[PDB]
Amino acid sequence: SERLSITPLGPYIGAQISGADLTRPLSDNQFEQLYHAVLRHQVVFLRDQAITPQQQRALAQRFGELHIHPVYPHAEGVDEIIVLDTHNDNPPDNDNWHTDVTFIETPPAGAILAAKELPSTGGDTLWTSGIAAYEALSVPFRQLLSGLRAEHDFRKSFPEYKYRKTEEEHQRWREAVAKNPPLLHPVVRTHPVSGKQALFVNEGFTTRIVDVSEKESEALLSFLFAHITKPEFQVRWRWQPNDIAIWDNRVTQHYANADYLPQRRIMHRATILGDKPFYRA
């Protein structure tokens, strides 16, 4: 593989890449750059790549160990890959800013989304840079946040009252809650590789900053959750059938619009595991 065409969709986050057939493995000249592409633009987009779960699970394992979701349905015979089929009976639930599975000791470092069945229009998906948003913070503020820890809870994005349709569904929730208690993650996170600083909190799971008072936390989080929706921090993608999206889950957050029902939307996703989030001067 000679090289790849990387087109930045913005100065901070965004990149549309081509010249990379994702149905068949790739060399080591290609991976490096594609790897460093996602590690550079935080989230890259590759089009026209009609690949099946196994193919998706394949590449995802090239980045690292994959993670299995405790409540979301998986594709047939393919646990590793979770399926997001949405309709009137199964409303969308990712229309909130979040960072995939930060409720575990070592949150996923990346993920690969793939469009299967898309509605006529809608279902756009956004990503926001945790590193930009940090840079946008005044010095006095970085000093404040850096060093503080914030709790993450599975229940915040998955409440019991939302998993009682059946007794099975309820049982699965109870188990998932059990294996995932609330735990701490730095407000400011140092990227394992780059070493760049980034805001590591997200509305989907962060319940509170334990290092300050309850109301100081409400006020700080109330600011951070708004701060990250600033346009200049994000890239927006309009989906098209058979499309690939790979992003770094250590320094970003995404949001998936809910505006296509009663139509049906089907997405497949691979979830690469990562290390222990941390902070360092």
Ligand X SMILES: O=C(O)CCC(=O)C(=O)O
Under the rule (CB under 8 A), what is the footprint of a second copy? 136-138, 140-141, 143-144, 147-148, 211-213, 215-216, 219-220, 222-223, 226-227
**Residue 100 falls in the annotated catalytic set:** yes
CA Rg value for the chain: 18
From the list 90, 247, 106, the residue with the least C-alpha distance to 189 is 106
Among 13, 60, 84, 246, binds ligand X (CB under 6 A): 84
CB of 249 to ligand X, least distance (A): 8
Contacts with ligand X in 96-115 (CB under 6 A)? Answer: 100, 113
CB of 235 to Fe ion, least distance (A): 15
For the chain, give the number of residues: 281
Ligand-binding site membership of 170 (annotated): no
Q: Is 50 left (phi over 0), alpha (psi -120 to 50) or beta?
A: beta
**Residue 98 falls in the annotated catalytic set:** yes
Both tokens assigned to 184: 């701490």
From the list 26, 69, 33, the residue with the least C-alpha distance to 269 is 69
Question: Do residues 274 and 146 touch, judged by C-beta distance below 8 A?
Answer: no
From the list 265, 269, 268, 267, the residue with the least C-alpha distance to 86 is 265
Catalytic residue among 100, 153, 243, 248: 100
Ligand-binding site membership of 125 (annotated): yes
256 belongs to the binding site for ligand X (CB under 6 A): yes
**Residue 87 falls in the annotated catalytic set:** no
Q: Which does 148 bind (CB under 5 to 8 A by kind): a second copy, Fe ion, ligand X, none?
A: a second copy
Please say which residue, 148 or 273, places its beta carbon nearer to Fe ion. Answer: 273
Give the Cα separation of 188 and 199 in Å (integer).
5
Q: Which does 219 bind (CB under 5 to 8 A by kind): ligand X, a second copy, Fe ion, none?
A: a second copy
From the list 227, 276, 265, the residue with the least C-alpha distance to 93 is 265
Point out the residues that are catalytic.
Answer: 98, 100, 254, 269
Annotated binding site: 69, 72, 94, 98, 100-101, 125, 254, 265, 269
